[PDB]
Amino acid sequence: PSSSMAGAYARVDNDRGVWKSPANIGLNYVSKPSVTVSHEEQESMNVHGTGKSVNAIRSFVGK
Amino acid sequence: VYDDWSDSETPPTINFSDLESGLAVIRKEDEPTLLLFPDATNLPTDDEFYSLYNSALMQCNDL
Amino acid sequence: SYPLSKFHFSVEWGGTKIGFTEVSGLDLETEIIEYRHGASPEYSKIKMPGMQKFSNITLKRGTFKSDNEYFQWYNTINLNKVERRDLTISLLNEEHEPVVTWKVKNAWPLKVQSTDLKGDGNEVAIESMELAHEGLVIQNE
Amino acid sequence: SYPLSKFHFSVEWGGTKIGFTEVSGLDLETEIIEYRHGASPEYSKIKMPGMQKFSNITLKRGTFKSDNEYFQWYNTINLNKVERRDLTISLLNEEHEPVVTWKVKNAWPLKVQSTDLKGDGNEVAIESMELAHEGLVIQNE
Amino acid sequence: SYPLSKFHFSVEWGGTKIGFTEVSGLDLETEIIEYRHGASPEYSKIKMPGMQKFSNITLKRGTFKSDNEYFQWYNTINLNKVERRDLTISLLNEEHEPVVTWKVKNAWPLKVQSTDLKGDGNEVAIESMELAHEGLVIQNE
Amino acid sequence: SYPLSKFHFSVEWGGTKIGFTEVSGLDLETEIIEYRHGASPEYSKIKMPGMQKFSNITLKRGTFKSDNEYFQWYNTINLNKVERRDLTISLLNEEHEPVVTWKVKNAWPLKVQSTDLKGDGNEVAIESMELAHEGLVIQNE
Amino acid sequence: GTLVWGARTLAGNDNEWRYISVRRFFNMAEESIKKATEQFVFEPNDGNTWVRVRAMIENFLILQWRAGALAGAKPEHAFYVKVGLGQTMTAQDILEGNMNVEIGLAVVRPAEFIILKFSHKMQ
Amino acid sequence: QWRAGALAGAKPEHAFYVKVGLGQTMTAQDILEGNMNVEIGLAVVRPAEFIILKFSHKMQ
């Protein structure tokens, strides 16, 4: 997903500004994530003892 | 998938572990609102039957 | 001990920007039903409340490069379908926080009006929109 | 960070020149259909989109020697036949390139108005035209 | 892609002029015969065509000096004899050529109606005629 | 939560075109049989269903160059014979698909009415047809 | 013919949750509201947001009332929505990024028993 | 940047500061070596991540 995210960063900077979080963004040309990540499964991705957080790409109904 | 018969008086059986696997899978989907098991009454014991339903109620409480 | 001024405000309408030049039409209205029977000592009628009405809301803003939102919302109309939105209008204090809020239900656009052009038109090009809605609630706590 | 001005523009209408003094009428409008059944708890109506309308477009220019184009286009009307044209109106930047474009389908002229004459009329003779059309699309990228 | 208008037309009736103010009554009609036998599962009737009818045709024109034609045709009636004519009615294009033609067989006049007179009657004196006939064919190629 | 509008529809009648200006007469009706015997405590009658009826259907369209279909269908009548057709009338959604369908059995034309002509008749020439039939079924799923 | 007779849950003596239609109505309303609130997840935690969230939730509930799902002569008797510093949130919640919204609903319950009584009419 | 909404604060005075000067950011030694020291501070806004809804049965 890294090139898609570089694209997404550019969109946010133009519509809302660089001071807004690059999240709650829909991606173009994407059918679906290859792996499904549940709510509970993301708890250790956002918060962890090492601080080495990972952001998630997720599918939402109707979005 | 459906298994075969051993004899005219000896039918296929239902494997409890297969239904638990299916329940673990549906847990990751967001859209479903109702949970049903069409072949639960054919489990070899009543104890397995009750165990399966206790798990389904616990899933509803967590989600 | 002092009243509020009328120039510091914001509008949340589902678009990218919240700044507007002008907002108008935040009205509420009720009909009257009148009656008199022939034997009354008074020669005038008694009055009671009827059905209710709402006015359309007008929003005005300046035209900017690459912002086509008035058109894009209008262009969601398809026979009887349209994207309906919740419209929130708020009068602000010195900390830029809400003081008086107008809450509007189920809005969509009746019309979009573009700017006129003039050879000696030394001024800003202003576009405007008129909105239909189904109800208004006023909050001031 | 700044809005667009309203005095630098051009009009492509099939004529020899593209300079105009005034352009107006670039509007879009939709009708409303209202409804209420008798058992509803609310005493007001629900609204949905109806049929659509367009306004006529007015163009104004100064009169010049040997240019009779307003008349010549008008004079193409023959019982129910007329020459129909694609009308393109554009707001320009500092390089004289389009910024905002209004695209108009199937236009033809309803009326052509000439200048008045005055003995003390110390001013430019201005002619004008009013156009009918079948649709407007707005482009701003 | 456009329908025909209704104001450019001509009438050939054997008179000197072909211009008229108004033409009406170009209708066709058939009778129905109904039937039901008692054993049918349906409780309604079956329908088939009967005999045919035609309506009378009305023509209206302005009165002119020295033109007495409505009267002269009417005055050809003698006990059961009358001059019968072929009536051709046509809707015209921009070249003044036929587009839609109504062909009428064996026409003659049932009645001729003159104008009323009024002291403050600031309008045109209009005379009219009603015609009987034996058949109508419609041509549109 | 909203009712259907009444302007987007189509008619399949065996002709080349399916566009119409106006459609009316889609009615169903039943007769009543009344009864009272002399010994009844009530001084009114008891009611039950009788035989059934249908109304004629009217269709209106604008006149176009080289389309003579109303006439051609009417002209298939020969003593008691006529071409009978299945008539399907449908109310459409935003995808231009059927929502409500009226199904009509064994239709044929009772009458064909032409346009009037006027010197100052600044309007579209509209022709119309009236149809007989043997039954109506309404589908709304 | 064959009818479904009775509509209680496995907690039949529960004063709030014994009926199926009450439990199902709440699950529906809760799901619809959270989908609507997701659009505000990464917004600033301040008064401007609190007002937008509240207004959105109230509009949803007004429509449910209009359709006859909720009890009450006017919306004011059918539901309430509350949010704010000193009402639902404290300083600590602002610091940790939390937002607290409280919602209450008036829900209608069914009758189960009909009793008829007969007698001989007399003066 | 403040006017555009990037920085926190009711007025610029609450959004940022800039300092420079001898005795404030620089000493005699910095002047001699050709150094210039400027100090800047900024008030920056952070996002909320969690929304909690609570439900109950309305009662008197």
Could you give the angle at the alpha carbon of F101 between the alpha carbons of F96 and F107, nearest 5°?
A: 120
What is the interface size between C and D, counted as CB pairs within 8 Å? 100
Distance from the Cα of residue D87 to its chain's centroid: 9
CB contact at 8 A, F106 and F14: no
Nearest to E55 by CA among E110, E14, E115: E110
Nearest to F49 by CA among E44, E46, E34: E44
CB pair distance less than 8 Å for F65 and E23: no
Which helix (H) or strand (E) element contains residue A13?
helix A2-15
Cβ neighbour number for residue A63 with a 10 Å cutoff: 10
User: How far is it, in rounded angstroms, from Cα A39 to Cα A56?
Assistant: 10
CB contact at 8 A, G100 and G71: no
Distance from the Cα of residue G122 to its chain's centroid: 50
Nearest to F137 by CA among F87, F94, F72: F87
Is some CB atom of chain C closer than 8 A to the CB atom of G52? yes
CB contact at 8 A, F136 and E27: no
Count Cβ atoms within 10 A of the Cβ of residue F98 and give its class: 0-12 exposed, 13-18 middle, 19 or more buried.
middle
User: How far is it, in rounded angstroms, from Cα H53 to Cα G101?
Assistant: 5
Chain H residues within an 8 Å CB radius of A18: 6
Is some CB atom of chain G closer than 8 A to the CB atom of C84? no
Distance from CA of D62 to the nearest CA of C (A): 12
> What technique solved it?
cryo-EM
CB pair distance less than 8 Å for H47 and A19: no
- Residue G50 has φ and ψ, to the nearest 5°, of -55, -40
Buried/exposed code over D35-58 (b: 16+ C-beta within 10 A; e: otherwise) = eeeeeeebeebbbbbbeeebeebb
Chain H residues within an 8 Å CB radius of C96: 10
- What is the SS3 assignment for F117? strand
HEC letters along C70-110: HHHHHCCCECCECCCEEEEEEEECCCCCEEEEEEEEEEEEE
Cβ neighbour number for residue E141 with a 10 Å cutoff: 9
User: How far is it, in rounded angstroms, from Cα F66 to Cα F62?
Assistant: 12
User: How far is it, in rounded angstroms, from Cα B24 to Cα A36?
Assistant: 13
Is some CB atom of chain H closer than 8 A to the CB atom of G22? no
Selecting from A23, A60, A61 the residue whose C-beta is nearest the C-beta of G42 gives: A23
Could you give the angle at the alpha carbon of C55 between the alpha carbons of C52 and C61, nearest 5°?
A: 160
Residues pairing with F109 in the sheet: F131
DSSP letter string over C20-86?
-SEEE---EEEEEEEE--TT-SSSS-EEEEEEEEE--EEEEEE--TT--HHHHHHTT-BTTB---EE
Which helix (H) or strand (E) element contains residue H40?
strand H39-42
Nearest to G81 by CA among G103, G97, G50, G113: G103
| Contacts for H2 with CB less than 8 Å, ≥ 6 apart | H9, H12, H15, H16
Residue D84 DSSP label: -
Residues pairing with G105 in the sheet: G79, H57
Tokens in use for F16? Answer: 């080349």
Q: Which amino acid is at G116?
A: L
Sequence-ordered alpha helix ranges (H) in D1-141:
69-74
Chain H residues within an 8 Å CB radius of C94: 10
- What is the SS3 assignment for D137? strand
For the range G74-78, what are the long-range contacts, defined as Cβ-Cβ under 8 Å and sequence gap of 24 or more?
G77/G106, G78/G105, G78/G106, G78/H58
HEC letters along chain G: CCCCCCCECCCCCCCCCCEHHHHHHHHHHHHHHHHHHHHHCCCCCCHHHHHHHHHHHHHHHHHHHHCCCECCCCHHHCEEEECCECCCECHHHHHHCEEEEEEEECECCCCCCCCCCCCCCCC
User: How far is it, in rounded angstroms, from Cα C123 to Cα C129?
Assistant: 20
CB pair distance less than 8 Å for D35 and F5: no
Distance from the Cα of residue H19 to its chain's centroid: 14
User: How far is it, in rounded angstroms, from Cα B40 to Cα B46?
Assistant: 10
Tokens in use for A31? Answer: 């059918």
Q: Which amino acid is at C44?
A: S
Taking the C-alpha atoms of H31, H32, H35 and H36 in order, what is their torsion angle to the nearest 10 degrees? 10
| Contacts for A51 with CB less than 8 Å, ≥ 6 apart | none
**Which residue bears the tokens 């047809």?**
F129
Chain F residues within an 8 Å CB radius of D36: none
CB contact at 8 A, A23 and A46: no
| Chains in touch with E (≥3 Cβ pairs < 8 A) | D, F
Which helix (H) or strand (E) element contains residue B52?
helix B46-62
CB contact at 8 A, E108 and E131: yes
Count Cβ atoms within 10 A of the Cβ of residue C87 and give its class: 0-12 exposed, 13-18 middle, 19 or more buried.
buried
Is some CB atom of chain G closer than 8 A to the CB atom of C58? no
End-to-end CA distance of chain F: 16
Is some CB atom of chain D closer than 8 A to the CB atom of G68? yes
Distance from the Cα of residue D97 to its chain's centroid: 20
Nearest to G103 by CA among G30, G35, G52, G20: G30
Distance from the Cα of residue F46 to its chain's centroid: 33
Q: Which amino acid is at A25?
A: I
Residues pairing with E28 in the sheet: E54, F112
Nearest to A8 by CA among A29, A24, A27, A31: A27
User: How far is it, in rounded angstroms, from Cα C134 to Cα C28?
Assistant: 11
**Is the alpha carbon torsion for A43, A47, A48, A50 positive or negative?**
positive
| Contacts for F88 with CB less than 8 Å, ≥ 6 apart | F11, F12, F13, F101, F102, F103, F104
Is some CB atom of chain C closer than 8 A to the CB atom of H59? no
- What is the SS3 assignment for D13? coil
User: How far is it, in rounded angstroms, from Cα F86 to Cα F101?
Assistant: 13
CB pair distance less than 8 Å for A38 and B28: yes
Residue B5 DSSP label: -
**Which residue bears the tokens 């994207």?**
C83
Distance from the Cα of residue F65 to its chain's centroid: 25
Residue E66 DSSP label: T
Sequence-ordered alpha helix ranges (H) in H1-60:
28-33
**CA–CA distance from F27 to each of E60, E64, F52, F105, F137 (Å)?**
39, 51, 11, 14, 10
